Symmetry: D2
Subunit: 116 residues, 4 copies
């Protein structure tokens, strides 16, 4: 709902399936406190991580375990993960799609942020 993570495999041209995603939120405090996690579906998407009420302002870290993904496909990738760190909901609730496009030695991440 307010947070969705979508992962693509740039080598296959496919969704990156079964990609583990961990979302953390920066506490008071400055530590990363576990916020949510999940795997991408066969569409490469991970929905349902959170809700409007739970997904409050914060600095969030979305950690995408790209390494396991590549390693399950036989590839020794460069990165340990793709992590995306951002301030969310700074000027009100938004919907965040966190897109990652994965290659063994490269990724990109894109945030699509929309306003209900």
């Amino acid at each position: 709902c307010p947070l969705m993570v979508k992962v693509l495999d740039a080598v296959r041209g496919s969704p990156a399936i079964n990609v583990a995603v961990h979302v953390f939120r920066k506490a008071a405090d400055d530590t990363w406190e576990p916020f949510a996690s999940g795997k991408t579906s066969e569409s490469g998407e991970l929905h349902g991580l959170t809700t409007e009420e739970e997904f409050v302002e914060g600095i969030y870290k979305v950690e995408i375990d790209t390494k396991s993904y590549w390693k399950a496909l036989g590839i020794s990738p460069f990165h340990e993960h793709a992590e995306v760190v951002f301030t969310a909901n700074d000027s009100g609730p938004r919907r965040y799609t966190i897109a990652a496009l994965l290659s063994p030695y490269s990724y990109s991440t894109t945030a699509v942020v929309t306003n209900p």
Copy 2:
């Protein structure tokens, strides 16, 4: 060196070596006239394409033969090639680095335009 092409391989994390690159200039009748070409070097770079005097304003196309590159590495590519089409100024040169980051199903191209 007003125009330079740099090509990287996102799969191997390496320069993309021996990638054919063609550069075209749009002619008055809107056809692509060949202008220059080369193959990226060991460093994934292609210098010497043109010179300041020759590299006049116009619309140029850089075609990077990504498909043959992926073919040579045994990897099914999606694109026939990566084209970059751009107007060279206004206003003046300026050096252009056309950077391409290649994956089998994705590429990015970026223009680093300096001076």
Copy 3:
């Protein structure tokens, strides 16, 4: 349906709306013959370009008028367009999503190719 083009604006984190897209297919012949065109919707997506029956094997060119997009937002971008050229349906009908992520001096394009 078998061809969809999705365009994102990496500067805003938004769909790239009202982006003109022209699809050509390479004729016999070697010329690019107009295949379909459209604009992206408010989701940055362009659906309905073609149909399974019309979208036969071919080399297709999807030309995304990124320049007009940027220029309507005040930006003199580097590229004239983003064009994506590919062989389609080489080993049978697939669904192609052609994604472009736009920045004034950079784009990426990603093909997500799936098999009904």
Copy 4:
């Protein structure tokens, strides 16, 4: 120069200059220990981070302060920063170029690992 950081600005088509970059090494207790830092140069590059002797195998994090960069250009950025986390070998060095292409709502990072 075993580790080099190059940062490009996709909005301006330019090197991303004066971007702060921190490099951390994962310590035995899994904390990030600061290792090196610098600011990208006129050319969007940051050399001299480390040396062969110092740049042992391990897991390293390169944090690129993309937010301050975009802040300085008056452009709202999405990310707090671009982190690149990677294991430096096996098997051996190898030079690492960590290339980052920045846009306000997107970045890519690419490792060009040579020798």
